[PDB]
């Protein structure tokens, strides 16, 4: 797939609004995933997954920054997430199915926090954006 | 579905605040906008040319009320979904030819809509409860496919 | 999803051996698919899906031929399959999930007919190749 | 699972000809080769660097035999897969931390291997019966996840 210019405009607008809450939204998305899709917990046996744990808060922040980086370099994601792409492919080795679950929980979080901005068109653009990030992150798996 | 008493009450409690016709129209419109391939069943509905046209189409809105009203009635039978949706499952397979993946898409779009509608009241545990319900309904509807 | 030179070599070699039987294997893959994953039948309400149906055999040949064309243009798949991407995206509108099911059935078909050639390395290359074809075919969905 | 008498006999008939040791080794080896991320559970197994390395690895062949032998056991209890696998379900979740999606990939690779091994005898109807079995097994193993 590919993002149209209109998609990039919607993402930039919505993400811009997240602004300084990116890390807090990042943490909430993870908590929503662990609760809704418990099988994702299999990748975090080394974490205190208790609500508000610093590990989750910290991880939520690293996830948010990476999304910020991709929004910023929306026209050259492969290059922007290169490092993350290697990490997931060669070390973490998270089954590709899990990316769709996190993407869903990130969309739900954004929805819950952006009443004005979460229109059908933006919703569509964000979904596509999350799918693209997911594709870039799993692109070096095999 | 296996929902604890707590989960059942959380589902029931939010649902009581829902305008079924409204959320129905919204959820169905958003499905057709976010996953355009789903428009394949709706060529008789008219103009689905833009998000605005989809969201504003009276046929989409009408089909949304119909779909969500059925969903809504199902909420009363959390313990017997397969039973409750058996005839509809057969209909969807034999006459309508609807790939059950569409039920899963709609369930995810429905959760996003509730999230957008309820904001902060749609907590992680209330989401989890709704996820089990939407998966349960999708499963119940796909049950009689052959 | 990048096809290395060895992947390309593997694919051309295996498809090479299919040769004349491509259409027969295409029909067999469809048959396997309809029996194993009944939901896929929802897209062919207009077909006689019985064993030996000429419609399935006819469709099987069209699929197999498209695959042959993909192997031939393995370096330029998007352009080679352009009309097929348009078709699936805008008219047929087959849910993307289904592509994985046909791909699996094609692999099972190849396995059952190419004992010698279906090594673990070739199996991996073919799986990557069918995932690339699927990606191309769904690239214009949204 | 729900198997017709003909599906049950097809499953049973083919399985009597399977050398579990040999097929188990092949199935697990092909899993690690085709979906290399699955190697993350087998860091202590040695060299999994090449297909040849993976396929002749004795720890792979050994483990493969264990897995299919346990799989063979559920074939005997097709009517109670969850009950048969409950203990191993809890083990894989709680101690092993294996994402259940891996059970699904193994199921698919196993089908490929039976087709490779049996050729023409692995007909469309036989495959279909096996696809229901492997899905049942994967489901039985993910059952106690929490
Ligand atoms: C939108 C998709 C994702 C993004 C942007 C993302 C990003 C990141 C980042 C930035 C890191 C930290 C890198 C470092 O510290 O060097 C990381 C690590 C990690 N991610 Fe991903 N990730 C995503 C999806 C997933 C999914 C779906 C899972 C599993 C369900 C996952 C599991 C992990 C784990 C286990 C770690 C290491 C945790 C630790 O030990 O700190 N990731 N990811
Ligand atoms: C919660 C999930 C769903 C429920 C409860 C549901 C329920 C219903 C009901 C109650 C009807 C009317 C049946 C009748 O005419 O007696 C119907 C018809 C129909 N539904 Fe479903 N539905 C669901 C999901 C879907 C989805 C996702 C699609 C397609 C993307 C779909 C496509 C259709 C179509 C095409 C019809 C026929 C409409 C007509 O003839 O006017 N349904 N559905
Ligand atoms: C590797 C994947 C696939 C390839 C290469 C492929 C290729 C093709 C080709 C060559 C045609 C004929 C176009 C024409 O009529 O000119 C076609 C049509 C069609 N395909 Fe796909 N296809 C693939 C996957 C799928 C899947 C997974 C489904 C659904 C389960 C599907 C459903 C259809 C349908 C319904 C038609 C129209 C058939 C008719 O009415 O004659 N395709 N495809
Ligand atoms: C058909 C599905 C499967 C069955 C029936 C099965 C069964 C078993 C059994 C019987 C054991 C031995 C327990 C013991 O004696 O300690 C085991 C261990 C194990 N399994 Fe599973 N297994 C299945 C699938 C998988 C998959 C797909 C993976 C990951 C790719 C996996 C990863 C493991 C690991 C890492 C161990 C521990 C090996 C060790 O002791 O180091 N299993 N499994």
UniProtKB/Swiss-Prot annotation, chains A, C:
SUPFAM superfamilies: Globin-like
One Pfam family linked to the record: Globin
PTM remark: The initiator Met is not cleaved in variant Thionville and is acetylated.
Impact reported for residue 69 to K: In G-Philadelphia
Impact upon substituting residue 86 to Y: In Atago; O(2) affinity up
Effect listed in the UniProt record for changing residue 60 to D: In Adana; unstable; causes alpha-thalassemia
Positions annotated to bind O2: 59
Modified-residue entries (Phosphoserine), positions: 4, 36, 50, 103, 125, 132, 139
Positions of modified residues (N6-acetyllysine): 17
Effect the entry attributes to changing residue 48 to H: In Hasharon/Sinai; unstable
Origin superkingdom: Eukaryota
Effect of residue 88 to N: In Auckland; unstable
Consequence recorded when altering residue 142 to L: In Legnano; O(2) affinity up
Effect of residue 126 to P: In Quong Sze; causes alpha-thalassemia
InterPro entries for this protein: Globin, Globin-like_sf, Globin/Proto, Hemoglobin_a-typ, Hemoglobin_oxygen_transport, Hemoglobin_pi
Outcome of swapping residue 96 to A: In Denmark Hill; O(2) affinity up
Note: Gives blood its red color.
Subunit structure comment from the entry: Heterotetramer of two alpha chains and two beta chains in adult hemoglobin A (HbA); two alpha chains and two delta chains in adult hemoglobin A2 (HbA2); two alpha chains and two epsilon chains in early embryonic hemoglobin Gower-2; two alpha chains and two gamma chains in fetal hemoglobin F (HbF).
Protein name: Hemoglobin subunit alpha
The species this protein was found in: Homo sapiens
Encoding gene (name): HBA1
From Swiss-Prot, chains B, D:
Positions that bind (2R)-2,3-bisphosphoglycerate: 1-2, 82, 143
Effect on the protein of changing residue 34 to D: In Santander; unstable
Outcome of swapping residue 5 to R: In Warwickshire
Effect of residue 36 to S: In North Chicago; O(2) affinity up
Stated consequence of mutating residue 27 to V: In Grange-blanche; O(2) affinity up
All copies of domain Globin, residue ranges: 2-146
The protein, known as: Hemoglobin subunit beta
UniProt organism field: Homo sapiens (Human)
Gene symbol of the encoding locus: HBB
